Swiss-Prot record:
Entry's Gene Ontology molecular function annotations: DNA binding
Whole-protein coverage range: 105 to 211 of 211
Further remark: MotA synthesis starts immediately after infection and stops abruptly some 4-5 minutes later.
Superkingdom of the source species: Viruses
Name of the protein in question: Middle transcription regulatory protein motA
Keywords: Activator, DNA-binding, Transcription, Transcription regulation
Function: Required for the transcriptional activation of middle promoters. Middle promoters are characterized by the presence of the conserved sequence [AT]3TGCTTNA (MotA box). MotA binds directly to MotA boxes.
Length: 108
């Protein structure tokens, strides 16, 4: 795996905020050099929060509510809804964005 120091720092912040807001994690994986925080208790369609080596923080979900998606795009996240209903929300990694993203996910 090729995990950078920035990724570790970003993942640490992500985990800190996920714990703060009561998101229960089954585990965190390092897969294809990406960090995946896998939710044990899926909420509002969200399956995992990710810190990817491509520079983005991503939310992987399934059949999320449109008005929920709107709150994420409202803070700068890009969104792609697949034919199967899977939703991919992306935004560039930064302390500010990680904080903003988790805050929104917590107020859903």
């Amino acid at each position: 795996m090729e995990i950078t120091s920035d990724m570790e720092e970003d993942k640490d912040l992500m985990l800190k905020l996920l714990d703060k807001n009561g998101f229960v994690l089954k585990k965190v994986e390092i897969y294809r050099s990406n960090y995946l925080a896998i939710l044990e208790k899926r909420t509002n369609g969200i399956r995992n929060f990710e810190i990817n080596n491509n520079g983005n923080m991503r939310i992987f979900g399934y059949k999320m509510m449109e008005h929920h998606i709107q709150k994420f795009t409202d803070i700068g996240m890009s969104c792609k809804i697949a034919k199967n209903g899977n939703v991919y929300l992306d935004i560039k990694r930064s302390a500010e964005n990680i904080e903003a993203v988790i805050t929104v996910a917590s107020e859903l």
